[PDB]
Amino acid sequence: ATLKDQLIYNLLKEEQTPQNKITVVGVGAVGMACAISILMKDLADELALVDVIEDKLKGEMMDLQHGSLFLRTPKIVSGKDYNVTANSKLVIITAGARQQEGESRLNLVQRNVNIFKFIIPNVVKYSPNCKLLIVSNPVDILTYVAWKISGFPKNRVIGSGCNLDSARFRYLMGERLGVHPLSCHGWVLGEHGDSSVPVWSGMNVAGVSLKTLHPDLGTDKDKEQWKEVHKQVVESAYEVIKLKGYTSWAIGLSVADLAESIMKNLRRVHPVSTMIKGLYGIKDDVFLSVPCILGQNGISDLVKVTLTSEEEARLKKSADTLWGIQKELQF
Amino acid sequence: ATLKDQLIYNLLKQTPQNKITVVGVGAVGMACAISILMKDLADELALVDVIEDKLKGEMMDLQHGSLFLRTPKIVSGKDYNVTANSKLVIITAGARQQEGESRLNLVQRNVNIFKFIIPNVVKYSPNCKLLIVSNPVDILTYVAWKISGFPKNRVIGSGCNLDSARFRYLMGERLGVHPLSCHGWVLGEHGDSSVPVWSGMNVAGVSLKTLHPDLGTDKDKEQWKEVHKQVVESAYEVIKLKGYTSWAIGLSVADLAESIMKNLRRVHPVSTMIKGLYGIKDDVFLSVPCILGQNGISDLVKVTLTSEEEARLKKSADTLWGIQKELQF
Amino acid sequence: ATLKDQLIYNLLKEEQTPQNKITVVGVGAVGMACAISILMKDLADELALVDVIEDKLKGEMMDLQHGSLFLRTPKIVSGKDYNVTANSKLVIITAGARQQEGESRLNLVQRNVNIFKFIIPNVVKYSPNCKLLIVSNPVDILTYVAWKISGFPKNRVIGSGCNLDSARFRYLMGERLGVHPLSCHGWVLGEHGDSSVPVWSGMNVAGVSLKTLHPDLGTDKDKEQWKEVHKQVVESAYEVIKLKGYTSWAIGLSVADLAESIMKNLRRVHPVSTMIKGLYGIKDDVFLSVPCILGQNGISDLVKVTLTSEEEARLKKSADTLWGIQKELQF
Amino acid sequence: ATLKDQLIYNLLKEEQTPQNKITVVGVGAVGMACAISILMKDLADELALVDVIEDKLKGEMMDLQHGSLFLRTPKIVSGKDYNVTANSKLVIITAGARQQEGESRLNLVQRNVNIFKFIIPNVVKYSPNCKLLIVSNPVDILTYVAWKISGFPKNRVIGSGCNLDSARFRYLMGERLGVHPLSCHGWVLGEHGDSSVPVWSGMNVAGVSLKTLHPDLGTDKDKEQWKEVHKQVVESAYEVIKLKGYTSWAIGLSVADLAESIMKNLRRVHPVSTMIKGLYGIKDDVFLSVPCILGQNGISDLVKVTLTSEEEARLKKSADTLWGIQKELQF
Numbered sequence A, C, D: 001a002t003l004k005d006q007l008i009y010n011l012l013k014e015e016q017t018p019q020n021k022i023t024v025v026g027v028g029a030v031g032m033a034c035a036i037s038i039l040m041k042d043l044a045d046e047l048a049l050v051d052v053i054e055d056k057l058k059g060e061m062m063d064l065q066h067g068s069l070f071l072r073t074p075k076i077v078s079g080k081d082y083n084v085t086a087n088s089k090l091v092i093i094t095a096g097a098r099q100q101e102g103e104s105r106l107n108l109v110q111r112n113v114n115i116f117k118f119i120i121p122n123v124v125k126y127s128p129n130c131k132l133l134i135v136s137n138p139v140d141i142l143t144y145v146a147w148k149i150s151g152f153p154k155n156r157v158i159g160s161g162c163n164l165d166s167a168r169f170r171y172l173m174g175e176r177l178g179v180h181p182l183s184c185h186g187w188v189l190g191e192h193g194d195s196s197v198p199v200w201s202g203m204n205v206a207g208v209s210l211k212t213l214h215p216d217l218g219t220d221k222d223k224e225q226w227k228e229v230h231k232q233v234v235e236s237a238y239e240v241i242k243l244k245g246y247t248s249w250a251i252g253l254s255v256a257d258l259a260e261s262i263m264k265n266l267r268r269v270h271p272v273s274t275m276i277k278g279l280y281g282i283k284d285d286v287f288l289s290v291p292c293i294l295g296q297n298g299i300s301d302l303v304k305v306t307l308t309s310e311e312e313a314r315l316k317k318s319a320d321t322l323w324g325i326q327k328e329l330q331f
Numbered sequence B: 001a002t003l004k005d006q007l008i009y010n011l012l013k014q015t016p017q018n019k020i021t022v023v024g025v026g027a028v029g030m031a032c033a034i035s036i037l038m039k040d041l042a043d044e045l046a047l048v049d050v051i052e053d054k055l056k057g058e059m060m061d062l063q064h065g066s067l068f069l070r071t072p073k074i075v076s077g078k079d080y081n082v083t084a085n086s087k088l089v090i091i092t093a094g095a096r097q098q099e100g101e102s103r104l105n106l107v108q109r110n111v112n113i114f115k116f117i118i119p120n121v122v123k124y125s126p127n128c129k130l131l132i133v134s135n136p137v138d139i140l141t142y143v144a145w146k147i148s149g150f151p152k153n154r155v156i157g158s159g160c161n162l163d164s165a166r167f168r169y170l171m172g173e174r175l176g177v178h179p180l181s182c183h184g185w186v187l188g189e190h191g192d193s194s195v196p197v198w199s200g201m202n203v204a205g206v207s208l209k210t211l212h213p214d215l216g217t218d219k220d221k222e223q224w225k226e227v228h229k230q231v232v233e234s235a236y237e238v239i240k241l242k243g244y245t246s247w248a249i250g251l252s253v254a255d256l257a258e259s260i261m262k263n264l265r266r267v268h269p270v271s272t273m274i275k276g277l278y279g280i281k282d283d284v285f286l287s288v289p290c291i292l293g294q295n296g297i298s299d300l301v302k303v304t305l306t307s308e309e310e311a312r313l314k315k316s317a318d319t320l321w322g323i324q325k326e327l328q329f
């Protein structure tokens, strides 16, 4: 008789798979911010971490494990071998190079496409029925790449896209109006990057159109220069990188927001990277952000946002830029 | 008429009500910050450090996640006026021991840092609770207590709250039980010299020491003493592997902040002025189980200790005082 | 040498005042649904319950106390004496009269005046600086009654108003569209219940106005009968009363959401009943729902919603009717 | 060309089973307290309610649905037909008759057998892999009844047992000591109600045995009368029933805590009713509360608490009494 069997009588001898497992690939600052945010939101019964830097991977895993008393995720594992990711409902990809001070996310394409050619087939091997949530940059291009490599249906390949750009826009609109961002509504669509599109025509508080109240909203003639709010959204990651070297907390919270809608099947609307072929006359297989209904099958529906002619032209410009990159990739 | 004034009619033009300050925006301070934010413990969070670009960037990165949070004001600055009217001020700033440096010299460097920080915290929040997280935490909790002039109930060290959480994690892994249902206390000094109180280790009120009398001894064939060895060594291991520890101490500290801010009167093993107990006759802070709430430490539990356990706490007190009596304030 | 003193060393005895205390007046089904919802949202460090039926009051308190292990509100108190309510940040009133067969609305409101002439001065005595949240019906008139008796400034007297009517609207819109109500936006304003006003222009998903897409929205010429959504907002409450005898759960959750914005100083926008003289075309001291910014000082600001001629006229007709009753009340 | 189709482009027809579904059977006060507590803890992605009182059932469902905006459980359904319960992970049974004037315990139990013969086969048909959590009283005997009728293995038939008795004990110990109940530890085992057994040896704060500190603990000689804490557990419930008519909130919260451990696979330890044959000299098919490890598959393990001879004899006497009733039941 050991202490454990003196103390505990066992009824059930058998291993069951987890019901709500999430994997995070990449344990850099973005991956770990996604991991802690998901842990504190009680979204998973198992969290797996994967990376190729084996000591940092084990250290991050242990540091999370040591906080288990304070969490409700009873199993946290890690390994360089993708077998640790088996049976995941949601696999969040954050691995890859990140942009340095002043560098475009679009400058990361060659490196991160090559990294994805290794990661995605291994994720798909061990969790053939997962949803993929791509966070690595440039996220629109890499969501297309993950879709092409995985062979998944496009509903199950979701880019974090402009969920964060829209959150930043709502934060800045809240600061100008003195209203919590939850009650400030406004969308930034298109590329998660320099060509994103602020949809002035949809901005509102309590269903009151700000453009109807202020017809010059967003234009160069605007005495209040609201276009500067979108400029600040575009420049946000650059400013934060210049100041602290990288960004992590806001994208971790944005990714956890997306994970909550997926894992809890909420059917909330988020601007995420998806194929927009068939909207706005676009015929190319281009991925960028539009508002999507998110739940347990990933993206089940696209919202058809009415755009002004100027907003639509900007969105088509974003799509042209991204498709010019995406069309040249070779698999 | 601005857009704002067309949209919004103003009824009227306050002091922070449930504010927390984190001093130091290294990995520990920011893990404390994110854990406090995702537990909705504060209506205002202030960050302070002296590295101004890093500080502003950390503040901005948190602010950009505001849509996903329920803490409507996040502020920062090198000037301590940003900390005014904090209920709880969490100190994580400090130097790390460098190659070759004596323990006394590292502590003295952190005394010198605290001589800048603590008076400024006290100026702007004279009625706060101070929660010291910086290492070596038991000595730096004494340092903060001396400099602040606060009563001992309002100066708390994070102490062995995390050591105990690690113990309960490791015990749960051995037994196949969640750590919430695995009870055991690690007391005394944080880190190397901590004391596992084997008599208190239990599941469902069943004493493991009574079931297994070799528990905690070297002759134990099951080597349960290895659980405490790993409480000590797993910290070193994380530091070797990833460079530092952050997430578990953030969650531990948010645990403590919850009991204080919500006045819960939960018991935690935190570092408190222990002069009077266990034959200890010096001004030293060690971890014992403390009742935590809105006035800080209001009460503590008098754990019955074996002869050997008591002697370990007294030896620790002697060691800490040996360093403290040499410090230059 | 008591067990307690053997076990516990006391460091100090200092008189504690709660920092985040809430009182609920009335422990009928509505009051208790508000209480359980506030407890399970961790909004208060002390909950006080008050009512005039002493046995029921004590029983409810005891039943909640027995669940303390599962909560993070360490003190729950109750009594018929208002001294238990001292130093509340927020006092929620759910008590008041039941209308009798044959009794005029004026006479019913006068009985509530007489009941509130007891309740409200006792609340004010013990928590002079609280916000008052009136949930008792008829809520818009009773919010006026509480404001008059309390002598509080407008910002600190709030009626729950159309907060639940709007939540019902968003639920019903989400059911039609297959979208979570969080992502379905729409506002019901004016009087709570029968005479409320659905603001069709503000009904939207992702900033897309349903009225713009579908100009017959809200009219009798609408083949999809979207007007029926607001008919159901009005009628679904009668239906719940017919089926189970009363409503409780949804108003409890509604009220807890208002309490969250107030207690956490969020400055979220809610349609609650506020003193609307000088705004929205009205000239009398009446309370109606409009979107209000809620936080630690109660209503600090409100949103000026652009209304159609018909909507404006309905709010004005409501104001005339409320003032017609209020001017005959005896305080 | 419907408004929904103008607004929303559908990608995905298919609809999956809910993945984290809970059913509550019985929509009396206990069942609805369980329902609201499970909803406010975000434990389920679908909640089903079943009862045979069809109007009350529909009313309760609608009242919860109207609070959807404030919840993260996107589907709430109800019906008399058990097809609404399909694919539940957890089925909570609160239905049953109360003991009437002049009624023997045997005949009350038999009336509840007759009720469970309708319920349990229908629950099993539609969720053959669920855990059954029996809350109906007398709970230890009705857990046996559910087990016999369902044919389920003992790990998937759980009685709420002494979980709330123990929570009450910890509340009362916290009141005496001035410590939150979370930091007061102590176990009430055996039969729920009058015959339950306070295990004095395990009562502790911070691992400090109160029995070792205060050897008279739990004896008649105790000057502090700690025995009366257990008497109060046995009677505070009768007291709540006397004062408000029934108990509900504390049950609802304690059942939601059980459900959290099961749905999140936490492997926390709870004192619940489980098949105890083979322990403490018991040789009959009887259910009593012992500390059990709860998770995805129900009860996976039991803690073998060390009992005094007196304590063990009390459990054996309970077992003899329960079997004396059970052996006379007609299935």
Ligand SMILES: NS(=O)(=O)c1ccc(Cc2c(-c3ccc(F)c(F)c3)nn(-c3nc(C(=O)O)cs3)c2O)cc1
Residues within 6 Å of the ligand: A025, A026, A027, A028, A050, A051, A052, A095, A096, A097, A098, A115, A118, A119
């Ligand atoms: N031979 S091996 O198996 O050791 C191996 C295979 C693949 C890679 C590619 C690779 C990965 C990577 C691969 C898989 C993961 F699961 C993962 F999390 C990350 N990150 N990364 C870089 N990261 C940065 C940064 O600044 O973070 C700059 S380059 C990179 O170049 C490397 C080694």
Ligand SMILES: NS(=O)(=O)c1ccc(Cc2c(-c3ccc(F)c(F)c3)nn(-c3nc(C(=O)O)cs3)c2O)cc1
Residues within 6 Å of the ligand: B023, B024, B025, B026, B048, B049, B050, B093, B094, B095, B096, B113, B116, B117
């Ligand atoms: N003249 S000044 O205003 O620029 C100024 C005043 C005080 C100090 C002291 C000081 C602080 C410090 C001071 C206040 C804070 F709020 C705070 F968070 C941290 N950190 N630190 C060091 N930290 C490390 C590490 O390894 O992290 C190594 S030295 C240090 O030497 C410096 C400058």
Ligand SMILES: NS(=O)(=O)c1ccc(Cc2c(-c3ccc(F)c(F)c3)nn(-c3nc(C(=O)O)cs3)c2O)cc1
Residues within 6 Å of the ligand: B096, B097, B102, B103, B106, B107, B135, B136, B137, B138, B139, B140, B162, B189, B190, B191, B192, B235, B245, B249, B320
């Ligand atoms: N009783 S005492 O106050 O004198 C005292 C406490 C702790 C230690 C050792 C010690 C130190 C440390 C490092 C360099 C020094 F110069 C120094 F004085 C102390 N950091 N640290 C950490 N613990 C963690 C964790 O995650 O648990 C991360 S770092 C730890 O356990 C010694 C003495």
Ligand SMILES: NS(=O)(=O)c1ccc(Cc2c(-c3ccc(F)c(F)c3)nn(-c3nc(C(=O)O)cs3)c2O)cc1
Residues within 6 Å of the ligand: C097, C098, C099, C105, C108, C137, C138, C139, C140, C141, C142, C164, C191, C192, C193, C194, C237, C247, C251, C322
């Ligand atoms: N603008 S006003 O203040 O004049 C006004 C407010 C409300 C009503 C009708 C009314 C009443 C009511 C009850 C007792 C009375 F004596 C009384 F006059 C009215 N209860 N109630 C409810 N609403 C719900 C729900 O769940 O929404 C459950 S009951 C409702 O909609 C009329 C006028």
Ligand SMILES: NS(=O)(=O)c1ccc(Cc2c(-c3ccc(F)c(F)c3)nn(-c3nc(C(=O)O)cs3)c2O)cc1
Residues within 6 Å of the ligand: D025, D026, D027, D050, D051, D052, D080, D095, D096, D097, D098, D115, D118, D119
């Ligand atoms: N023909 S029918 O469909 O209308 C129908 C079928 C089965 C039953 C059995 C049944 C139920 C019952 C059945 C299923 C549930 F889901 C449920 F929640 C409760 N309660 N109950 C009684 N309850 C009491 C009390 O004193 O409460 C006294 S008899 C009883 O006799 C009835 C009707």
Ligand SMILES: NS(=O)(=O)c1ccc(Cc2c(-c3ccc(F)c(F)c3)nn(-c3nc(C(=O)O)cs3)c2O)cc1
Residues within 6 Å of the ligand: D097, D098, D099, D104, D105, D108, D109, D137, D138, D139, D140, D141, D142, D164, D191, D192, D193, D194, D237, D247, D248, D251, D322
């Ligand atoms: N071991 S056993 O299964 O035979 C058994 C269980 C329970 C009782 C006493 C008992 C009964 C009860 C007893 C006999 C009946 F015929 C019956 F219908 C109900 N209800 N109840 C309640 N407890 C609460 C609370 O909130 O704790 C509210 S009611 C309670 O404590 C005796 C034996």
